[PDB]
PDB file of C-alpha atoms in Angstrom:
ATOM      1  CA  UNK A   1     -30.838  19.775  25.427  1.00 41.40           C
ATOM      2  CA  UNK A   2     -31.353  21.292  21.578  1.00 40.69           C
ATOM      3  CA  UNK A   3     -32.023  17.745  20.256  1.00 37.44           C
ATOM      4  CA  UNK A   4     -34.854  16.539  22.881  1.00 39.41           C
ATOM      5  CA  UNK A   5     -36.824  19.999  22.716  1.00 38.91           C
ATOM      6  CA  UNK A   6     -36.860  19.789  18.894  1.00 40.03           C
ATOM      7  CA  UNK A   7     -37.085  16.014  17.704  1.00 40.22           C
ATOM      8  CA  UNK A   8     -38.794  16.718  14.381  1.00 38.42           C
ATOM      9  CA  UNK A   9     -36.704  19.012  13.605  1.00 40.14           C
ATOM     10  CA  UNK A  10     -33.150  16.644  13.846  1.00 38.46           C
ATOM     11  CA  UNK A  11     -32.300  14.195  11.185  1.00 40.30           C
ATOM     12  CA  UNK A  12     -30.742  11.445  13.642  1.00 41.69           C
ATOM     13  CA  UNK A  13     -34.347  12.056  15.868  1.00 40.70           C
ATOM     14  CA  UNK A  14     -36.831  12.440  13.222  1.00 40.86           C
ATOM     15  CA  UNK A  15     -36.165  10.471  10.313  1.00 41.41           C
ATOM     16  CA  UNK A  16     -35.894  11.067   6.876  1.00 43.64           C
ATOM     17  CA  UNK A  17     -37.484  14.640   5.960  1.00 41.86           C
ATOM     18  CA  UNK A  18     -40.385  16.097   4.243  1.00 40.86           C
ATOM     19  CA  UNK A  19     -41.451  19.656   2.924  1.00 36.96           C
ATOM     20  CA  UNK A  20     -44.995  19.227   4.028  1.00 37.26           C
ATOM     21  CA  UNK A  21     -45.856  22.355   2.397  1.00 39.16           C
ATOM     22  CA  UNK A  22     -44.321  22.118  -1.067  1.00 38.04           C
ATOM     23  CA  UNK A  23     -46.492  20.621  -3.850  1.00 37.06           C
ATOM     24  CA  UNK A  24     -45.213  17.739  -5.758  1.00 37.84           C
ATOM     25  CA  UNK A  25     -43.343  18.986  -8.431  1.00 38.95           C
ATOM     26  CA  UNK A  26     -43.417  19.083 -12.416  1.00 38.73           C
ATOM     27  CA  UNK A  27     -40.447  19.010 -14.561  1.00 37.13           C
ATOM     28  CA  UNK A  28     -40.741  21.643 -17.691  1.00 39.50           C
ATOM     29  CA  UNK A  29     -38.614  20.265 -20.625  1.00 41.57           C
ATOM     30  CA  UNK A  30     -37.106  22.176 -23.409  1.00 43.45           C
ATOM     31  CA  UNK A  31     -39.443  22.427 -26.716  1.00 42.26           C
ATOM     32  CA  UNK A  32     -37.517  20.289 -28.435  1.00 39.40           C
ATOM     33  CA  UNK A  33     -36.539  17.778 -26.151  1.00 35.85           C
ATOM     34  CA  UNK A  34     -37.403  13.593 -26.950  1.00 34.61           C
ATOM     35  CA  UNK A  35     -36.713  10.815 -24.411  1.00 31.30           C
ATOM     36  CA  UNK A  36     -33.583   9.273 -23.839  1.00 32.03           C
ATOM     37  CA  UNK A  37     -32.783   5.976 -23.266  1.00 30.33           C
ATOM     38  CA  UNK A  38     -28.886   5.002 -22.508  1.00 29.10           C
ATOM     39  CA  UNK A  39     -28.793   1.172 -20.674  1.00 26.33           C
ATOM     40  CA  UNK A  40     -27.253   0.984 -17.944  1.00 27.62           C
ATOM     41  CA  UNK A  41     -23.656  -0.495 -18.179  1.00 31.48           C
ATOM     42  CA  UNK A  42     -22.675  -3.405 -16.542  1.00 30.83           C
ATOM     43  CA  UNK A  43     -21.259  -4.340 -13.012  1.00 27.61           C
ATOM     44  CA  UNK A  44     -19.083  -6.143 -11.112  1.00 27.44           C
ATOM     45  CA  UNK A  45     -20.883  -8.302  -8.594  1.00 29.98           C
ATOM     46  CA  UNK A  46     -19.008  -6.211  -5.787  1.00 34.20           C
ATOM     47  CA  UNK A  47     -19.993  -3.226  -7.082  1.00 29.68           C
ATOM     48  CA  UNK A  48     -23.880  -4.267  -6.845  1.00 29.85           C
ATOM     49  CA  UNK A  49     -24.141  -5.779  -3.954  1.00 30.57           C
ATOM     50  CA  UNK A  50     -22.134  -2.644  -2.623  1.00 30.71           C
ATOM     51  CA  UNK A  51     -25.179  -0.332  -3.185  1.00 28.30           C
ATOM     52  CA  UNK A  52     -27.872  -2.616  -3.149  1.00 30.85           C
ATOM     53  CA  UNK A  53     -28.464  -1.628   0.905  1.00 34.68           C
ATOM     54  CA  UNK A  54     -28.557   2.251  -0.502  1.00 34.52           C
ATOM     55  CA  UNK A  55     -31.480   1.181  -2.829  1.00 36.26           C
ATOM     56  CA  UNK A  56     -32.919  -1.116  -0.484  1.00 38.14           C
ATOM     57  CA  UNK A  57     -33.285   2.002   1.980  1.00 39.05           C
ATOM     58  CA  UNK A  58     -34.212   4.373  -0.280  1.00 38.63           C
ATOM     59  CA  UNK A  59     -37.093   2.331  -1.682  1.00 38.50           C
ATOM     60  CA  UNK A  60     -37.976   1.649   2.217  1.00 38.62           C
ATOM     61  CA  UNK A  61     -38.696   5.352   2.482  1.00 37.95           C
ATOM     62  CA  UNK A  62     -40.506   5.404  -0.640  1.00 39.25           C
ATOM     63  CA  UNK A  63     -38.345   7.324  -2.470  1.00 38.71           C
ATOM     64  CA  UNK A  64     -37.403   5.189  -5.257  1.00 40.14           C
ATOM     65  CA  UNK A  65     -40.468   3.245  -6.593  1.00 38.32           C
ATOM     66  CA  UNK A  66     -40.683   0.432  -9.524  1.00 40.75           C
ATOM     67  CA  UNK A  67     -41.330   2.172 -12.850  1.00 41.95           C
ATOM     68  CA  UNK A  68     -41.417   1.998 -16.701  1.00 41.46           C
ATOM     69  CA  UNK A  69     -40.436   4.591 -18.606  1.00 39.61           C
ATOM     70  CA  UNK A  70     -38.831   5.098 -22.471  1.00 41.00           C
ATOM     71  CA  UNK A  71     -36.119   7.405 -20.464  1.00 41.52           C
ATOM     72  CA  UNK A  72     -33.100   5.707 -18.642  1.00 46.69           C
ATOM     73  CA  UNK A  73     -29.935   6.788 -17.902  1.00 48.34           C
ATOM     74  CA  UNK A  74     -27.216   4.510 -16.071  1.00 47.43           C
ATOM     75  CA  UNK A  75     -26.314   4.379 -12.687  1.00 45.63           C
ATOM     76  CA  UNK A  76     -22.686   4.267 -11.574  1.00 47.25           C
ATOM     77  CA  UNK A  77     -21.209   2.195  -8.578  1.00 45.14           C
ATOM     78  CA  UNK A  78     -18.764   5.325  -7.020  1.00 41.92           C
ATOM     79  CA  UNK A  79     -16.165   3.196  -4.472  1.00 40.32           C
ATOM     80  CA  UNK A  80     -15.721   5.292  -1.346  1.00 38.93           C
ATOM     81  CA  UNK A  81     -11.820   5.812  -1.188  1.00 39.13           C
ATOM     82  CA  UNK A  82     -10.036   3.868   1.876  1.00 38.77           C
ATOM     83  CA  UNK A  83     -13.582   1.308   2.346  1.00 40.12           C
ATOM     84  CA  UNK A  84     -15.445  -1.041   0.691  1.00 40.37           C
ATOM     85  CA  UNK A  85     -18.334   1.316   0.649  1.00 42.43           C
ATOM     86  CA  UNK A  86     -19.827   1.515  -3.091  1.00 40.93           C
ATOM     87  CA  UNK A  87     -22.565   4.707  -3.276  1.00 41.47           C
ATOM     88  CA  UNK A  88     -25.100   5.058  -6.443  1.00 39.58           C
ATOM     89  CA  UNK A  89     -24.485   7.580  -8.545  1.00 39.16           C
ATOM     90  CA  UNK A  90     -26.807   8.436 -11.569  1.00 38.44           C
ATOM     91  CA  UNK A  91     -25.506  10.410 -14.478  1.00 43.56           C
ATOM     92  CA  UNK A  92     -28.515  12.851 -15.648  1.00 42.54           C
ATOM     93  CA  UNK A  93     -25.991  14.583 -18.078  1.00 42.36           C
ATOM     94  CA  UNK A  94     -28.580  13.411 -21.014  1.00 42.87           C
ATOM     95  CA  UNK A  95     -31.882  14.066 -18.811  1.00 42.94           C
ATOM     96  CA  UNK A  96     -30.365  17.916 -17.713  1.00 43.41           C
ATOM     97  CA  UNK A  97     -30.052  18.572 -21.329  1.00 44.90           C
ATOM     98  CA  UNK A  98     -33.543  17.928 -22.147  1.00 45.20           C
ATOM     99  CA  UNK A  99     -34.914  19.708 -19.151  1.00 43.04           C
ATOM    100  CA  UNK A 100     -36.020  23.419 -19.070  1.00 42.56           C
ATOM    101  CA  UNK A 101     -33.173  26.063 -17.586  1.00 44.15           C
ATOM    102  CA  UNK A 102     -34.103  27.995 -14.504  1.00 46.56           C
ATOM    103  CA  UNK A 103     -32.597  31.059 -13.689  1.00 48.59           C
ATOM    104  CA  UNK A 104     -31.032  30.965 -10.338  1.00 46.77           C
ATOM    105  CA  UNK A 105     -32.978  33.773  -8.121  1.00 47.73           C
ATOM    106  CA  UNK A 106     -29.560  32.408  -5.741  1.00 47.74           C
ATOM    107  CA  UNK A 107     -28.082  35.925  -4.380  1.00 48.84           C
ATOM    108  CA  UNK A 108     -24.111  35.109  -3.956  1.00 47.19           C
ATOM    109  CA  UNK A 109     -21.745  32.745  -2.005  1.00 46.12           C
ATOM    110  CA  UNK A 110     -20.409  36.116  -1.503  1.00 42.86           C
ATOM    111  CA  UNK A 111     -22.452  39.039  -1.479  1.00 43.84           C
ATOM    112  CA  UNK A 112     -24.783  36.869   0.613  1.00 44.98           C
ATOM    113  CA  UNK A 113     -22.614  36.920   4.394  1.00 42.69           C
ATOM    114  CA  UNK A 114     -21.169  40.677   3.253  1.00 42.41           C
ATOM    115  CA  UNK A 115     -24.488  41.554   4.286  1.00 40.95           C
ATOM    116  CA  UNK A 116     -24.348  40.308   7.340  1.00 38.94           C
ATOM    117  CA  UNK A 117     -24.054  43.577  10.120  1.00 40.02           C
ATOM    118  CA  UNK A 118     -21.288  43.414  12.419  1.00 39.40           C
ATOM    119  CA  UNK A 119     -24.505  44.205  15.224  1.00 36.74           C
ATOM    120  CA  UNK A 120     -25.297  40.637  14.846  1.00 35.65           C
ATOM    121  CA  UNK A 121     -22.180  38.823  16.790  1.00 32.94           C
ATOM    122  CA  UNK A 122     -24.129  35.651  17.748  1.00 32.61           C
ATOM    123  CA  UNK A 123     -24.752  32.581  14.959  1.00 32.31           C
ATOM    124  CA  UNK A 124     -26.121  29.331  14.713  1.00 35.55           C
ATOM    125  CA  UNK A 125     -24.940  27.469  11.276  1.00 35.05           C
ATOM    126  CA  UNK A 126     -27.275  24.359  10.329  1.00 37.56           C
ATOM    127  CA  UNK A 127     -26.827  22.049   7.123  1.00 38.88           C
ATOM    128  CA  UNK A 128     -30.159  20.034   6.266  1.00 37.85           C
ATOM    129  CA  UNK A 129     -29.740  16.802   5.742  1.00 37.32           C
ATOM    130  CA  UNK A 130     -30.829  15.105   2.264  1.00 36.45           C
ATOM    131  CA  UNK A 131     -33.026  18.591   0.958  1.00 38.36           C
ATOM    132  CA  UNK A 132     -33.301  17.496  -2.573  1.00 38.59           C
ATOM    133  CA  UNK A 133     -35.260  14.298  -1.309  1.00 41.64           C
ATOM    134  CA  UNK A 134     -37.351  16.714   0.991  1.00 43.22           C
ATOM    135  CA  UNK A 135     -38.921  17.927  -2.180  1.00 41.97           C
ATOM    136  CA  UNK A 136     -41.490  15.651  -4.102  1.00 41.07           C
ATOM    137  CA  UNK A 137     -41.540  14.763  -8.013  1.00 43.08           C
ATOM    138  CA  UNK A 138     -45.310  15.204  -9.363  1.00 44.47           C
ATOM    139  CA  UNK A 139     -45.698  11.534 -11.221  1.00 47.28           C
ATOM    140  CA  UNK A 140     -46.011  13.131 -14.396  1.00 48.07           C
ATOM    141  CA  UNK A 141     -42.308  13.964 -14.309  1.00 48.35           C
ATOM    142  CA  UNK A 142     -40.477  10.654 -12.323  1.00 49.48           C
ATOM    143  CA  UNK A 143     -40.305   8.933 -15.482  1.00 51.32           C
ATOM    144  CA  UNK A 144     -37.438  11.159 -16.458  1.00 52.77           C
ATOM    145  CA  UNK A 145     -35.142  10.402 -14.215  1.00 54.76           C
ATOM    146  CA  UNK A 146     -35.544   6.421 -14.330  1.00 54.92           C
ATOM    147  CA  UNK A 147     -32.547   3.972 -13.988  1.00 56.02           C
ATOM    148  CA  UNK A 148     -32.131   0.177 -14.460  1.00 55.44           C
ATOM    149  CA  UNK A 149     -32.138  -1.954 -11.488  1.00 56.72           C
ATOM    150  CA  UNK A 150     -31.908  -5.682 -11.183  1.00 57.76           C
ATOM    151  CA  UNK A 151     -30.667  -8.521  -8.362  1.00 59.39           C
ATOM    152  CA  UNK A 152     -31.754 -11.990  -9.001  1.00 58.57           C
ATOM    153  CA  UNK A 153     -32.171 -13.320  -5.089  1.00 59.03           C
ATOM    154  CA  UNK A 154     -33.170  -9.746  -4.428  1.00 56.51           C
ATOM    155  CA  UNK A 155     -37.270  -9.353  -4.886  1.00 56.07           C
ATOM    156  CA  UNK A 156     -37.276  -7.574  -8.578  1.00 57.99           C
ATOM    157  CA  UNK A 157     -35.639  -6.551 -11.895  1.00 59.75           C
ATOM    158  CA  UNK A 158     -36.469  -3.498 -14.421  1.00 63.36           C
ATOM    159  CA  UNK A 159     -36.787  -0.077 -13.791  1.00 66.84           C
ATOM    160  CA  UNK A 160     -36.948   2.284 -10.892  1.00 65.64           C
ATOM    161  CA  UNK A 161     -37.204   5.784 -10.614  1.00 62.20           C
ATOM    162  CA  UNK A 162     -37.490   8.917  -7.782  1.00 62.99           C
ATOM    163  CA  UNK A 163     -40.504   9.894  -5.943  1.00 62.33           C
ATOM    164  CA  UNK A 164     -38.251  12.745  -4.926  1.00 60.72           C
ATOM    165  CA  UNK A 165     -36.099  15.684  -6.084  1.00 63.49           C
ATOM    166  CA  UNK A 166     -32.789  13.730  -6.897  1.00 63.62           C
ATOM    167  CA  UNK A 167     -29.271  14.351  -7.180  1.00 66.87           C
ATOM    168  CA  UNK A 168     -27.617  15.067  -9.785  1.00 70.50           C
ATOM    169  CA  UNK A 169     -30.137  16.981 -11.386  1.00 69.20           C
ATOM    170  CA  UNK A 170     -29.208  20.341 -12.397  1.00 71.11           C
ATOM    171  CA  UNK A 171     -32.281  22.053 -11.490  1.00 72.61           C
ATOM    172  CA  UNK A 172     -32.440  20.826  -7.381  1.00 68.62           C
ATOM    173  CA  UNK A 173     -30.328  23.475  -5.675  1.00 69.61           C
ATOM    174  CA  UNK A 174     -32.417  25.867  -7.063  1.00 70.67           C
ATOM    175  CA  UNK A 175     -35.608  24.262  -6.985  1.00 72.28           C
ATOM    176  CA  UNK A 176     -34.990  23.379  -3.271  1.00 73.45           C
ATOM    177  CA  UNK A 177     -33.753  27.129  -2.287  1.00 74.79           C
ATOM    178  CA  UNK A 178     -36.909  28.913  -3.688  1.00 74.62           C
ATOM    179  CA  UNK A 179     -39.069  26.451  -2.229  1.00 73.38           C
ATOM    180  CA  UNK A 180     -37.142  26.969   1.151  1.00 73.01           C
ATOM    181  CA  UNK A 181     -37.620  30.210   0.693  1.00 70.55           C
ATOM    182  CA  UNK A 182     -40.970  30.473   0.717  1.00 73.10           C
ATOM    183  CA  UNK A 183     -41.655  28.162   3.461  1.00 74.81           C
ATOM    184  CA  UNK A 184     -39.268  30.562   6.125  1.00 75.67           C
ATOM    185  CA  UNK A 185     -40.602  33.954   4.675  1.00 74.85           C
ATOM    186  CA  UNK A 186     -42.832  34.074   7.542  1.00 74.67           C
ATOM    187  CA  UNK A 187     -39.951  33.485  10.050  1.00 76.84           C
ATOM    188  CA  UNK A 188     -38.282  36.370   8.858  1.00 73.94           C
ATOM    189  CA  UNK A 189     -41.156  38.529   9.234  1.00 75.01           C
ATOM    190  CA  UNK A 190     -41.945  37.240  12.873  1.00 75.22           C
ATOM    191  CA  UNK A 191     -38.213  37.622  13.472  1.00 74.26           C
ATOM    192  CA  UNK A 192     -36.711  41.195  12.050  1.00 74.96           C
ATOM    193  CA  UNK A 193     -34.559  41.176  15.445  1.00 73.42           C
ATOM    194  CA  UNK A 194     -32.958  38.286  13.797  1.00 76.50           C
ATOM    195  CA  UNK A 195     -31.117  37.850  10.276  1.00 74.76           C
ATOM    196  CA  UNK A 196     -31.461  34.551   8.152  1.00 76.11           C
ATOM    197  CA  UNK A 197     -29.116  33.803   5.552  1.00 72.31           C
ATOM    198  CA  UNK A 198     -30.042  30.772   3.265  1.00 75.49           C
ATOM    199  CA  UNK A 199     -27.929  29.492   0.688  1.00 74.64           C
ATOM    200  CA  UNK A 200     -29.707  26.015  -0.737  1.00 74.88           C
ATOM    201  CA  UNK A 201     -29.461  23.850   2.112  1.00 77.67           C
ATOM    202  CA  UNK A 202     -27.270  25.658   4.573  1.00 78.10           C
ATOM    203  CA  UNK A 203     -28.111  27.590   7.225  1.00 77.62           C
ATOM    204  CA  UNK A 204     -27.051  30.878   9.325  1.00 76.96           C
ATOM    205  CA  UNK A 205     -29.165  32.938  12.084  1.00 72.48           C
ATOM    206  CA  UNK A 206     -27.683  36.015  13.437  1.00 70.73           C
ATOM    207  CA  UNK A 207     -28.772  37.577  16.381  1.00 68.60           C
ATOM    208  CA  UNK A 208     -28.068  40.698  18.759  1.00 64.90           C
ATOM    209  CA  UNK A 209     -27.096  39.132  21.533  1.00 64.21           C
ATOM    210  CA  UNK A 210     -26.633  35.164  23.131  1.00 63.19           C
ATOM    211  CA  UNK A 211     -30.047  35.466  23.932  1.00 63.34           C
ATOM    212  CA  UNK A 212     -32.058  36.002  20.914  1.00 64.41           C
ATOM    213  CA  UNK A 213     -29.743  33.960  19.107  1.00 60.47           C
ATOM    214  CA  UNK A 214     -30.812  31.274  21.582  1.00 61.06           C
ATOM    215  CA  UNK A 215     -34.485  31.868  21.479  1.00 62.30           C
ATOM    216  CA  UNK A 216     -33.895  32.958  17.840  1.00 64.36           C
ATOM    217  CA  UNK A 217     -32.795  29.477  17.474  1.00 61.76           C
ATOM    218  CA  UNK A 218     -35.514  27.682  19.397  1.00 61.24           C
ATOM    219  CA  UNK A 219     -37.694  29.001  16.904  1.00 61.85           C
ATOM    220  CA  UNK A 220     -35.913  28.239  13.862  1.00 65.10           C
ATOM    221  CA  UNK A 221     -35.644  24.753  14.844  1.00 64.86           C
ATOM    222  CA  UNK A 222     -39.556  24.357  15.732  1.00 63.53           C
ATOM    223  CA  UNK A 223     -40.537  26.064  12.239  1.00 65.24           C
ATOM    224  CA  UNK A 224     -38.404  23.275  10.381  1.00 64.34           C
ATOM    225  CA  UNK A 225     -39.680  20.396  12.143  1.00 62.70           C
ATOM    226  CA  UNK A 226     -43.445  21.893  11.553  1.00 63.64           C
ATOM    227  CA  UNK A 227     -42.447  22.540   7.975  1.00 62.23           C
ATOM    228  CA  UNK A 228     -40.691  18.513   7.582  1.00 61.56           C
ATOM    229  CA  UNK A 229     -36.952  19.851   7.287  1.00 61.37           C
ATOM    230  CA  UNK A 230     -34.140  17.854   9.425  1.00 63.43           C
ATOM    231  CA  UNK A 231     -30.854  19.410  10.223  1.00 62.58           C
ATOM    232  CA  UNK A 232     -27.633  17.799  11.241  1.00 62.60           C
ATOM    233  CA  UNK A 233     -27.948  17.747  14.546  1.00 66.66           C
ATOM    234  CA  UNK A 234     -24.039  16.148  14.676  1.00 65.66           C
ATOM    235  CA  UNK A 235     -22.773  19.567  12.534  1.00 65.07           C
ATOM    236  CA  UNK A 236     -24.875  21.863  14.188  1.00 67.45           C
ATOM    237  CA  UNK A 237     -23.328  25.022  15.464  1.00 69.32           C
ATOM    238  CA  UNK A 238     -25.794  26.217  18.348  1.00 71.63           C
ATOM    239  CA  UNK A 239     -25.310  30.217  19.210  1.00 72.30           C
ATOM    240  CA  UNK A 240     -21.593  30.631  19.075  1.00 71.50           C
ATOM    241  CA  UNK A 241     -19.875  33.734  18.252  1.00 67.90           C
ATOM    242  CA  UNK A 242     -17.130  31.667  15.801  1.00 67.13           C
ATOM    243  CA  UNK A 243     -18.549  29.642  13.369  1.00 67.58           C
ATOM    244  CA  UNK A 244     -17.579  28.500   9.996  1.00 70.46           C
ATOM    245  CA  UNK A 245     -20.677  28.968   6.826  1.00 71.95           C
ATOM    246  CA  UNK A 246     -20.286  28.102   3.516  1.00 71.39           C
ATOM    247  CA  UNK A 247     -16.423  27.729   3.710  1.00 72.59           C
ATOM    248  CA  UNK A 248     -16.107  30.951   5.373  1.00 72.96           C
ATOM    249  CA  UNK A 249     -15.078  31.721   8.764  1.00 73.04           C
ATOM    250  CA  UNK A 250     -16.845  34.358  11.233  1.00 71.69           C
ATOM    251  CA  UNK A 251     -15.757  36.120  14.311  1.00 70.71           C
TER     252      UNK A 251
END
């Protein structure tokens, strides 16, 4: 139904993502600020082998790429509770320090739905899947966030680094919601019948009526799989008059 009108536009239908619009970007660093290079600390053979599928895939997509750079920081085997699922985890701490702040244009958690007029009784919530990675690093800055990699039997050893805006990185929530931003400004002014609330990488559309909201949604959907964005189609919340954004509940 939603999911075979709008393939591009679903993360389980159309892949991994990709703002087509956004330039790659640069990384400003502080004034001061002098590469860092902490080694990455060592591993249990579990532990490797636990996330060497998660870096196999991600350098698949060609989001992590073989690199050398005088930055490093280490990478940290996190053990899903309950399984035997290990997930890599890179701690920027050292490489946030050194980068330029940028001052959150981010309205509210808050102030953001008490906008929201009680005319507009129909919503669709959607949650896009991997933003940050939606976003692309200009070359000049991937060297920052390098790691060490290495896996004998495996095809390589040395250095790897983002092609992409990664996590951890104190900057990407709001470096991924201005850039959203100005890639559904149009929306909003081909829509004023409709109200879009965007906070980062979750999504609510209000509408008048089950109608709009349904068209309303139609249209959403088509202007994020022109633009390279994937929503969860599996969390989705298609026109409902109950639906639960950003930890909040509506009715």
């Amino acid at each position: 139904t939603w999911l075979s009108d709008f393939p591009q536009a679903w993360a389980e239908t159309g892949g991994m993502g990709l703002a087509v619009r956004q330039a790659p970007l640069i990384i400003p660093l502080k004034a001061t600020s002098t590469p860092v290079s902490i080694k990455q600390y060592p591993m249990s053979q579990e532990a490797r082998l636990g996330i060497k599928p998660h870096i196999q895939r991600l350098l698949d997509q060609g989001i992590l790429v073989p690199c050398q750079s005088p930055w490093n920081t280490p990478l940290l085997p996190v053990k899903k509770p309950g399984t035997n699922d290990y997930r890599p985890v890179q701690d920027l701490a050292e490489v946030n320090k050194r980068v330029e702040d940028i001052h959150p244009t981010v309205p509210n958690p808050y102030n953001l739905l008490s906008g929201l007029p009680p005319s507009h009784q129909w919503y669709t919530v959607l949650d896009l899947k991997d933003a940050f990675f939606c976003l692309r690093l200009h070359p000049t800055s991937q060297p920052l966030f390098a790691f060490e990699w290495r896996d004998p039997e495996m095809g390589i050893s040395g250095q790897l680094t983002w092609t992409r805006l990664p996590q951890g990185f104190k900057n990407s929530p709001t470096l991924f919601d201005e850039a959203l931003h100005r890639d559904l400004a149009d929306f909003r002014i081909q829509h004023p019948d409709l109200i879009l609330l965007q906070y980062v990488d979750d999504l609510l559309l209000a509408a008048t009526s089950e109608l709009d909201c349904q068209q309303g949604t139609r249209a959403l959907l088509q202007t994020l799989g022109n633009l390279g964005y994937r929503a969860s189609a599996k969390k989705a919340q298609i026109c409902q008059k109950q639906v639960k954004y950003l930890g909040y509940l509506l009715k």
